[PDB]
Amino acid sequence: PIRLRELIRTIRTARTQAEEREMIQKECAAIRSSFREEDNTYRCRNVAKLLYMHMLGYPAHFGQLECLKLIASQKFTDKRIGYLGAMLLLDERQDVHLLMTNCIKNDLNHSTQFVQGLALCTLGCMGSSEMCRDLAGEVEKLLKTSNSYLRKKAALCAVHVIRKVPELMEMFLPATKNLLNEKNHGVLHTSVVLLTEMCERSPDMLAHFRKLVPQLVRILKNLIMSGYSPEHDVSGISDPFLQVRILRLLRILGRNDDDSSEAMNDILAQVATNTETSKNVGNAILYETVLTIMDIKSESGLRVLAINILGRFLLNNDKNIRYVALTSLLKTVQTDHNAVQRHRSTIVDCLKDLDVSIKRRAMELSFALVNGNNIRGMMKELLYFLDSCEPEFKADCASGIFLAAEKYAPSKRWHIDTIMRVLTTAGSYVRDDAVPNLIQLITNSVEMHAYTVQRLYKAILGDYSQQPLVQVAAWCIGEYGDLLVSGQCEEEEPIQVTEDEVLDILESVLISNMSTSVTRGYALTAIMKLSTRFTCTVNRIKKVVSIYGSSIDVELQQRAVEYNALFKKYDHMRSALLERMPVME
Amino acid sequence: EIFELKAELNSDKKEKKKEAVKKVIASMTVGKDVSALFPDVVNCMQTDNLELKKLVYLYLMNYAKSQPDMAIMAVNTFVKDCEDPNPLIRALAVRTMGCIRVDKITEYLCEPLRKCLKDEDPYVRKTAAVCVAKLHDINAQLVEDQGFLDTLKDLISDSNPMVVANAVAALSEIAESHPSSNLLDLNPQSINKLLTALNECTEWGQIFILDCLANYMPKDDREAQSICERVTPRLSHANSAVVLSAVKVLMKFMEMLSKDLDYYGTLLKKLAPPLVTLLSAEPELQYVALRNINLIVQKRPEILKHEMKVFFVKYNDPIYVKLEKLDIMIRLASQANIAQVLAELREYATEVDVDFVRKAVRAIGRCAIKVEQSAERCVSTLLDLIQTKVNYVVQEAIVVIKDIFRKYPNKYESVIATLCENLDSLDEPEARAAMIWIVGEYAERIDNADELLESFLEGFHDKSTQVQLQLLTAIVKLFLKKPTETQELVQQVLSLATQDSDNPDLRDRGYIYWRLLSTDPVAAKEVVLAEKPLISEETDLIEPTLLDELICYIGTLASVYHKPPSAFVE
Amino acid sequence: KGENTSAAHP
Amino acid sequence: TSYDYCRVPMEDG
Amino acid sequence: MIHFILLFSRQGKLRLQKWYITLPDKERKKITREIVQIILSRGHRTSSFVDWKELKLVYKRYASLYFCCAIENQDNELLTLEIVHRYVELLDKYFGNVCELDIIFNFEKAYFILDEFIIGGEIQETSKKIAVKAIEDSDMLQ
Amino acid sequence: SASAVYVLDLKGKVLICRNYRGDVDMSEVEHFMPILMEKEEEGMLSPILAHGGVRFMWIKHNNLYLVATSKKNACVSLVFSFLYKVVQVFSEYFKELEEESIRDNFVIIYELLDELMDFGYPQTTDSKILQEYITQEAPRPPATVTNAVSWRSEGIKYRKNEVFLDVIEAVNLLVSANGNVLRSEIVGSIKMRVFLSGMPELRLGLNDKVLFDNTGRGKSKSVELEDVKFHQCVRLSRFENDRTISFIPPDGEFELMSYRLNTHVKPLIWIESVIEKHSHSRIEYMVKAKSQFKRRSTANNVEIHIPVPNDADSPKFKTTVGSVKWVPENSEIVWSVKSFPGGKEYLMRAHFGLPSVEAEDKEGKPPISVKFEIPYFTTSGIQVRYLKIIEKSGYQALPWVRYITQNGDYQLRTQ
Amino acid sequence: EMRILMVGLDAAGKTTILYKLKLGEIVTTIPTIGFNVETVEYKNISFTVWDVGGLDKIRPLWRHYFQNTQGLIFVVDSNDRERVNEAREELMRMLAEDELRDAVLLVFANKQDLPNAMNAAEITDKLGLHSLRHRNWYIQATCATSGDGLYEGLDWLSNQLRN
Ligand SMILES: Nc1nc2c(ncn2[C@@H]2O[C@H](COP(=O)(O)OP(=O)(O)OP(=O)(O)O)[C@@H](O)[C@H]2O)c(=O)[nH]1
Ligand SMILES: [Mg+2]
């Protein structure tokens, strides 16, 4: 029965993992030999050893009986290590954590406030939705006291019982009434978090809670004007942890309101200029202030200064502040869309930053920045950016160019130009979900298909390994080859559309193993479609369907038989069912 | 800091500069940037001591590209050190001359290398033979201008066969990088001279001169048999890299014998025990041993067809041998050895490594596809492996039972009745669509096909492309086999397929099925439920034009990937 | 080693 | 080498 | 609402983990190993904010040992770094010149400071005095 | 054709590096351990790692990754047998092989990695011959390095002239879970200890079936050699002619021949066991051990391992003969019996506990693997017959032999 | 030293029995979802009694205490004739296992105040305790609110610990 730090020292004297596992299992078998002895003396350091074995990631499932037995002790350090073993060894789907219910409920009625401290800590950190339905009657009971050590823990345990059971939030409304004049800031902070969660859940609680807006306006006033405090102070600012939460409860109030929005006016006008803009902390306060301004129905005169603040944030060389500014303008895209667009040069300047996240947020900000005026000059730089990307940026950019293009295309020609340019330059990184969007938009087009399918065939003759490229291309050929091959029923003077390599390129897509077996489905479907679309060279593709008929893939083997029966037995039915497919939305 | 070390280096005492150069190469051991200490350790090089000059040669080797402009100050010392009565310092200077890859240096290094070629003591001869290839990789046409290739051929015509061995090694390496202009092939009398030089050199030279024979081809019957008569005792060698190249040239030359004679049969009956005893090596050789046995038994399967028992895996073996003995037992399962193979594959799915279990179930599938007398035992064993109801075992056994059915659809109607209860919370789309096909193709001995496809049609619009497409095939096949019970079912699966979904192949198949229903639903019995052709499988027996190319490359990186040697090198 | 450095202490 | 040896014949012509 | 709190070393070993979203054990070992791969492979002017899977993940380097948290992506970000800053100061003020080994050998007390500073995701004690005074009063009970 | 023979640590920094050609850049070693992790966690743990057009061949000793890079089409078994011979040479110098050696005996190991290879080619890899010109305590190189006979430097003299032969059986076996033999093969290895004077010649006399059939005495007791792979010292063409093992022996320890036959005589130690694995309670091992061979020999220090559940607890062991220690390091029992006579049966009955709450992952079913060793007895029936000393001097040497029966990988399967 | 379980249905007064054996009184008792554990010292033998919750969803999790168990207190309710079928089903799901195979059985028929409450023989032949084998069973009807027979049952239980 060694100590805990003895086990930590013995494990740190292991060299390779193939010996460190041996040293784990050595003392682990001693723990398991101890647990068949029912020793109630050494059991604290036994479960401490077991928790340190778990924190590396070794087997620790067997030691949950004894965490339940440590919580069912009577001494203090035993229950301490027991609730630690509960928070590390038990979760919602462990399926044996329900035996903690009686012990947590009794330890919410222990005389020492510290035992109830752990009994609120464990239920807050890992309480399941079926644990909360048996404990929320006592959770609100420990909010009905006034012991300030326990109110601050019961409030966040009530936040957790909101989070895991949303339909039980009505029995905490009568408890949270007029406790917002408490001088102790910890209970005040947890109550502001409780009000933020309650105001986030239901609008039925918004009408109950938007009456006490000037009360917490006064609280924020007495926190800002309190120049110094012995504790609570980080970098000369009186308790920013509660300042941001009060500004966030002010953010999610008055966002669709006029009276409460004007109630919170002049304190925002105060804190917008009374911010210590040197450290991290005051700029965090100022960013939260700008987010609170842009979400509530504020006066436009505040937003002048707020956009000036955001113009300053782009200039401050802390990359923290640059990520803050990119997230800022990414949030106020719709609200004040005009004033964001005059920061466009600075936004495009951030595309070459040496951070992954700065490039990501600047890319998403430029995508959300696209209006029906900036579509032209921005897409050249964006598709230059995509070709100059790194390969983990390509999916979000390839989806974003398509989403920005389908909304605000100035002309149908340049729209398909940009889309085809993206399908050439991206290749195996555009996601497979946007391919029906591309097909649906090009079939929404009615007047331009030759300029589509000619450039399609001029593109795919060089490459076929770009898989969504040929996913688009095989359907495009199969539905609009009649505009590709134009008036060429017999051999004429040579045009580059040739109706023999037009079929041979699909044959090459089929034969070559650079095919995702849905490219082959598209290709077979196009082969069968071009029997009616083309009267030029037929009964050569019937040979292809015939020689394709005993292939190994299942769906293609069904499709080849279903085409073979039509080409051999029911040729009077083939031209009747190869009508163009109707258009949906 | 390093100025102190350069001051120790600029001393005059021996036991100061010796500790200086040991401190330099101790910094270079961990890789401390000692590249500024180049132009002064060149001075403390021409020394009488020998345990010091190896360290200075090491420094010149590791920082030759590092100082491309200062490196000229060693060449006079090289041509001095290549003129010594103790041959060790000469051959050491020679093997350090070749590794220095600077084109300004190799201009002056030809004539002392020429002088060290024709030297007496064969140590420096066989070292200069390798230095010929060292120089040829750097600057090839300078070696052609200095006419070293004739002298390289002259060392093949020499006695004391280690000089001949390194000459053969450098010959093969130079003729590889050549465009085969003046190819270095030989008359058979020199090949008999190499066969006399095979019993005497080192065990590594007996790989090099068993790699020159990979480029020669004989012309006769008694010629090939006569040289293979003396290559044959080399297979009784312990060092298991010699055995592999001997197998390489025997597999090359056994395409020349007369098969009616008694030498080809005695060749086949003496080649199998060494290829089996290769499996008792140390395990990072057994991976290359298994990939080359894979390359052999596809070519000539008459060899190992009587010894299955050695390709059973053991629990001490790592993953890369456990994946490959499965492939070999696929390539060797015949009609006489079904029981031990299926018994052993039954005791492979009860492991914990998931990829091994998946590959073992696929091995059961390739066994049932390969031979036909034992598909019944394969189906019984696969249903027994489904009866543990572990998720990955079932998710591969479903696809394997499907691939048995698409090969052998005939007599398995009393089997699918258990397959309907198969824990249809089965998750992976590569097996759900397989179960959909199994229901749809065989919904006449399965009575409740519609009421399970209800469960597969609730979350229809977000599964996959393949699973939705198999549903669209299978429900139409169901309604064609039974039109009474599923009349609204075909309508609602078309309405989910044609109206709401914009998956384009799913729309195409949906409108094709809808137009076939609206035109002639009686004709669909001849259109979609036709007599399917017997499926030509994916025979992974490689191209014999490519397989005969990989006979020439056995024991190389082209012989593990099973790829041609131009498909992965750059 | 490198572990005995304290965290804060600017 | 606690297992003790035995002597073999040399010539055995 | 902090989803998890990770304390992982420079070499890749784990020193303190805490989960406020009850996801299962094999998912824990996938997520943890991937995030430890993500943060260790990044430069030194990259703003210490990583967008990882709908979570604006916040980390800060205070030693060879790294501290990692993840806030929910509609709240402020710099305050999560200041939460980590306060937790550094609480570990120092309870121990006294906090070391790596003091986090390693006395990890149970590091979890207890984390519990008396955070339950359920948020900050249950904004004072840097009352939390350490209460936890030393709890130790004063023993 | 390696371009750089590397020795890495268990992390990814370089213990010692030795490049030859310039085909592989020295910066390319830095990718080895991330590629190792990224290929190991997805089932693709292969000895040939890939980084673009740069390959990575490697073997793994205890703390060492002997990495061998290449860029072109390297001859692979050449490089792997080169790496194992480098391991055996370093174990001839340094009796253990750790990081304590490589970062401190770097005076001589760079010279060794210069000597063993030039331009990617293994050339001089015998340990004893490498000793007499590479020492840690320099003259002209010995001519034995250049000479055809390259494993015995002349001038060796001892006062007596002793030659010790050790014939080592090693039974490989894998009995299935029903009770039948799948594979009963024997990998035998004759290891010799030669202390002779000068340049002798030895011709080994075996009771081979093949040599007796060429002679006409294949009706007495003989051994069926299914395959034999000799050392380099044996002139193999003379063995090909008339089964004659002619060799100039090396000095000291070497391995003579590595034969491998099959034998359908019964297994030496039979392990019948039962497992009453009750869920979440306990487990019972009523295992019995009988010996099929004769009633005269004694099996020294056997170690009948039986793999157990991973997290069992409170073991009990009621035996009749021989001790038990339960070893939870590898989660195995080690049933050890020191003096084990032939033909008898020793019964053992274990009993554990097992945890209530079931695990997250399953545990696997490893096989029973015993570790027996018997002297003065061979299951094969092979007897060495003569050993002629040939010498220009001409004297009386003393060929001594003993017969050792060991195991190889003597596994028996479980339930 | 004797590990003792208190399994049984809900509303059976097993927690009433537990707090009557420990304290000596009848305290206010909520429905015990989890478990309870006390050490009651009686006839110089320490009885570690694991009182197990008797709600519906907890009944699968009862196997976690069946290990090292030397005796069983199986509390039934006497005013519920409509709950004896599920009680016997739970009982023969419990007593027929390899873990907890040598432990004695002590079934308590609590709550003997109403004419709905049966005697010991009727509850015995509703459980069919003569059909058991390799068990040292003994049922005992009790009155937990007055403490009737509980220490008598513990006296018999202490006879069953030693042999
Ligand atoms: N009259 C009478 N009532 C009893 C007696 N024992 C228990 N009860 C009643 O039975 C009811 C249920 O018993 P409890 O102990 O409170 O709860 P339980 O049966 O143990 O169920 P759990 O709490 O889930 O374990 C109590 O409200 C008591 O009033 C008894 O001996 N006499
Ligand atoms: Mg109760």
Q: How far is CA A251 from CA A290, B550, E2, F296, in A?
A: 10, 71, 19, 93
Angstrom distance (rounded) from CA A261 to CA A251: 9
Q: What is the 8-class DSSP label of residue B500? A: I
Distance from CA of B231 to the nearest CA of F (A): 9
Q: Compute, in angstroms, the gap from residue B448 CA to the centroid of ligand 1.
A: 51
Which residues make beta-bridge pairs with F384? F206
Contact A75, A86 (CB under 8 A): no
To which residue do tokens 């990186």 refer? B557
Antiparallel, parallel or unpaired: β E118-119 and G71-76:
unpaired
Query: Taking Cα atoms as reference points, which of G102, G2, G106, G101 lies closest to residue G49?
Result: G2
* DSSP class per residue in F67-132: EEEESS--BHHHHHHHHHHHHHHHHHHSSS-SHHHHTTSHHHHHHHHHHSEETTEE----HHHHHT
Q: Residue F292: give the domain boundaries.
A: 269-375
Amino acid type, B512? I
Sign of CA dihedral F177, F179, F182, F185: positive
What are the tokens at F269?
A: 């130690």
Angstrom distance (rounded) from CA B135 to CA A471: 52
Q: Compute, in angstroms, the gap from residue G100 CA to the centroid of ligand 2.
A: 22
How far is Cα of residue B542 from the mean position of the Cα atoms in its chain?
14
Method of determination? cryo-EM
Antiparallel, parallel or unpaired: β F323-327 and F368-369:
unpaired
Angstrom distance (rounded) from CA A529 to CA A325: 53
Query: Taking Cα atoms as reference points, which of E75, E54, E53 lies closest to residue A200?
Result: E75
Sign of CA dihedral A256, A262, A266, A269: positive
**G13 in ligand 1 pocket by Cβ < 6 Å?**
yes
Angstrom distance (rounded) from CA A433 to CA A431: 6
What are the tokens at F82?
A: 């080169």
Q: How far is CA E100 from CA A50, C6, E16, E39, E97, in A?
A: 21, 8, 12, 19, 10
Per-position b or e across B188-225, b if 16+ CB within 10 A of its CB = eebbebbbebbbbbbbbbbbbbbbbbbbbebeeeeebb
Which residues 6+ apart lie within 8 Å of A215 measured at CB?
A180, A181
Map out the domains of chain E as residue ranges.
1-142
Sign of CA dihedral A221, A227, A232, A234: positive
**Closest C-alpha to ligand 1, atom 7:** G13
Half-sphere exposure of A199 (CA within 13 A, CB side): 26
Rg over alpha carbons for chain F, rounded to the nearest Å, is: 26
Does E112 reach chain A within 8 Å, measured CB to CB?
Answer: yes
Contact F130, F89 (CB under 8 A): yes
Run of H or E residues at E119: strand E118-119
Amino acid type, D2? S
**Closest C-alpha to ligand 1, atom 1:** G111
**G12 in ligand 1 pocket by Cβ < 6 Å?**
yes
> Annotated binding residue at G15?
yes
- Burial (CB count within 10 angstroms: exposed 0-12, middle 13-18, buried 19+), residue A297: middle
- The CA-based dihedral angle spanning residues F335, F337, F342, F347, taken in that order and rounded to the nearest 10 degrees: -50
Per-position b or e across F3-14, b if 16+ CB within 10 A of its CB = bbbbbbebeeeb
Run of H or E residues at E5: strand E4-8
* SS3 label, residue C9: coil
Number of domains present in the structure of chain A: 1
Dihedral pair phi/psi, residue A194, rounded to 5°:
-60, -45
- Burial (CB count within 10 angstroms: exposed 0-12, middle 13-18, buried 19+), residue F299: buried
Angle at A143 between CA A141 and CA A144, to 5 degrees: 65
Of E62, E91, E99, the CB nearest to C3: E99
* SS3 label, residue B296: helix
Cβ G98–F281 below 8 Å, yes or no? yes
Subunits adjacent to chain D (3 or more Cβ pairs under 8 Å): F
Cβ B473–A558 below 8 Å, yes or no? yes
Contact B361, B353 (CB under 8 A): no
Of A521, A555, A577, the CB nearest to B512: A577
Contact B330, B368 (CB under 8 A): no
Dihedral pair phi/psi, residue B353, rounded to 5°:
-80, 120
> Annotated binding residue at G14?
yes
Contact F340, F302 (CB under 8 A): yes
- Nearest atom, ligand 1, residue G32 CA: 23
Amino acid type, A532? T
Contact B211, B242 (CB under 8 A): no
How far is Cα of residue G48 from the mean position of the Cα atoms in its chain?
14
Dihedral pair phi/psi, residue F167, rounded to 5°:
-95, 120
* CATH 3.30.56.10 assigned to G1-163: no
Contact A172, A144 (CB under 8 A): no
Query: Taking Cα atoms as reference points, which of F334, F336, F327, F333 lies closest to residue F299?
Result: F336
Are 3 or more Cβ–Cβ pairs between F and D shorter than 8 Å? yes
Angstrom distance (rounded) from CA A143 to CA F399: 94
Cβ A552–B469 below 8 Å, yes or no? no
Does F358 reach chain E within 8 Å, measured CB to CB?
Answer: no
Q: Can you give the CATH number for the domain in which F126 is found?
A: 3.30.450.60
Chain D partners within 8 Å of F391 (Cβ):
none
Contact F159, F184 (CB under 8 A): no
What are the tokens at A2?
A: 């060694």
To which residue do tokens 């039948």 refer? F180
Angstrom distance (rounded) from CA A2 to CA B63: 54
Are 3 or more Cβ–Cβ pairs between E and C shorter than 8 Å? yes
Antiparallel, parallel or unpaired: β F117-118 and F14-19:
unpaired
Chain F partners within 8 Å of A29 (Cβ):
313, 326, 328
Contact B329, B294 (CB under 8 A): no
Q: Can you give the CATH number for the domain in which A115 is found?
A: 1.25.10.10
- The CA-based dihedral angle spanning residues E25, E30, E33, E36, taken in that order and rounded to the nearest 10 degrees: -100
Query: Taking Cα atoms as reference points, which of B547, B492, B1 lies closest to residue B299?
Result: B547
Cβ E62–C3 below 8 Å, yes or no? no
Angstrom distance (rounded) from CA B383 to CA B388: 9
**Closest C-alpha to ligand 1, atom 2:** G111
What are the tokens at A220?
A: 């924020």
How far is Cα of residue G73 from the mean position of the Cα atoms in its chain?
2
What are the tokens at D8?
A: 């073999």
Contact A149, E134 (CB under 8 A): yes
Amino acid type, A35? F
**Closest C-alpha to ligand 1, atom 9:** G13
What are the tokens at A324?
A: 């803050």
What are the tokens at A78?
A: 């035993």
Cβ F356–G98 below 8 Å, yes or no? no
Judged by phi (left if over 0) then psi (alpha if -120 to 50, else beta), residue A151 lies in: alpha
What are the tokens at G126?
A: 């509703």
The full 3-state SS of A425-463, as one line of letters, equals HCCCCCCCCCHHHHHHHHHHCCCCCHHHHHHHHHHHCCC
Run of H or E residues at A285: helix A280-295
Angstrom distance (rounded) from CA A431 to CA A437: 11
In this structure, how many other beta carbons lie within 10 angstroms of the beta carbon of residue F293? Answer: 18
Antiparallel, parallel or unpaired: β F398-412 and F162-175:
parallel
- The CA-based dihedral angle spanning residues F33, F39, F40, F41, taken in that order and rounded to the nearest 10 degrees: 110
Cβ F385–D6 below 8 Å, yes or no? no
* CATH 1.25.10.10 assigned to B1-570: yes
What are the tokens at B398?
A: 């479903």
Angstrom distance (rounded) from CA B82 to CA B93: 6
How far is it between the farthest Cα atoms of chain A? 101
What are the tokens at B401?
A: 């039972």
Angstrom distance (rounded) from CA B382 to CA A116: 56
Angstrom distance (rounded) from CA A324 to CA A345: 18
Per-position b or e across A435-458, b if 16+ CB within 10 A of its CB = bbebbebbbeeeeebebbbbebbe
- Burial (CB count within 10 angstroms: exposed 0-12, middle 13-18, buried 19+), residue A143: buried
The full 3-state SS of F237-272, as one line of letters, equals HHHHHHCCEEECCCCEEEEEEEEEEECCCCCCEEEE
Amino acid type, F258? S
Q: Compute, in angstroms, the gap from residue G74 CA to the centroid of ligand 2.
A: 13
Q: Compute, in angstroms, the gap from residue E123 CA to the centroid of ligand 2.
A: 37
Angstrom distance (rounded) from CA B368 to CA F290: 40
Amino acid type, G21? L
Angstrom distance (rounded) from CA A329 to CA A311: 10
Rg over alpha carbons for chain B, rounded to the nearest Å, is: 34
Amino acid type, E71? I
What are the tokens at A193?
A: 């978090």
Q: The domain E1-142: what is its CATH number? A: 3.30.450.60
Q: What is the 8-class DSSP label of residue A350? A: G
Angstrom distance (rounded) from CA B387 to CA G108: 43
The full 3-state SS of A217-264, as one line of letters, equals HHHHHHHHCCCCCCCCEECCEECHHHHHHHHHHHHCCCCCCCHHHHHC
Which residues make beta-bridge pairs with F19? F4
Query: Taking Cα atoms as reference points, which of F196, F150, F244, F204 lies closest to residue F394?
Result: F196
Which residues 6+ apart lie within 8 Å of E57 measured at CB?
E35, E49, E50, E51, E68, E69, E70
Contact F4, F27 (CB under 8 A): no
Run of H or E residues at F351: strand F345-353
Dihedral pair phi/psi, residue F337, rounded to 5°:
-130, 125
Query: Taking Cα atoms as reference points, which of A176, A96, A88, A47 lies closest to residue E115?
Result: A88
> Annotated binding residue at G54?
no
Dihedral pair phi/psi, residue B439, rounded to 5°:
-70, -45
Amino acid type, E135? I
Contact F309, A28 (CB under 8 A): no
Distance from CA of E17 to the nearest CA of F (A): 20
Measured in angstroms, the resolution is 4.3
Run of H or E residues at A568: helix A554-569
Which residues 6+ apart lie within 8 Å of B96 measured at CB?
B57, B60, B61, B78
How far is Cα of residue B346 from the mean position of the Cα atoms in its chain?
28
- Nearest atom, ligand 1, residue G113 CA: 1
Query: Taking Cα atoms as reference points, which of A62, B343, A120 lies closest to residue F311?
Result: A62
Q: Compute, in angstroms, the gap from residue G27 CA to the centroid of ligand 1.
A: 10
Map out the domains of chain B as residue ranges.
1-570
What are the tokens at B180?
A: 């085969």
Which residues 6+ apart lie within 8 Å of F301 measured at CB?
F336, F338, F371, F372, F373
- The CA-based dihedral angle spanning residues A199, A205, A206, A212, taken in that order and rounded to the nearest 10 degrees: -90
Map out the domains of chain G as residue ranges.
1-163
Which residues 6+ apart lie within 8 Å of F11 measured at CB?
E11, F33
Angstrom distance (rounded) from CA A65 to CA A34: 13
Chain F partners within 8 Å of B287 (Cβ):
46-48
Q: How far is CA E137 from CA E90, E102, E126, in A?
A: 15, 20, 18
**G111 in ligand 1 pocket by Cβ < 6 Å?**
yes
> Annotated binding residue at G121?
no
To which residue do tokens 């080859």 refer? A481
> Annotated binding residue at G10?
yes
Cβ G67–F353 below 8 Å, yes or no? yes
Residue in chain B closest to F133 (alpha carbons) equals B88
Identify each DSSP E strand in A374-441 by its residue range. Answer: none
Query: Taking Cα atoms as reference points, which of B500, B491, B501, B410 lies closest to residue B464?
Result: B501
Subunits adjacent to chain E (3 or more Cβ pairs under 8 Å): A, C, F
> Annotated binding residue at G13?
yes
* SS3 label, residue E66: strand
Which residues make beta-bridge pairs with F401? D6, F165
What are the tokens at A190?
A: 């947890």
Angstrom distance (rounded) from CA B215 to CA B552: 8
Angstrom distance (rounded) from CA B420 to CA G12: 45
Angstrom distance (rounded) from CA B529 to CA G45: 80
Contact F298, F341 (CB under 8 A): yes
Q: What is the 8-class DSSP label of residue A175? A: T
Q: How far apart are the first and last CA of chain C?
A: 21
What are the tokens at A427?
A: 């290749």
Which residues 6+ apart lie within 8 Å of B130 measured at CB?
B95, B98, B166, B169, B170, F118, F119, F121, F123
Angstrom distance (rounded) from CA A275 to CA A224: 10
Contact G94, G137 (CB under 8 A): no
Per-position b or e across A200-213, b if 16+ CB within 10 A of its CB = eeeeebbeebeeeb
- Helix, strand, coil shares, percent, chain E, to 5: 45, 25, 35
Antiparallel, parallel or unpaired: β E118-119 and E122-123:
antiparallel
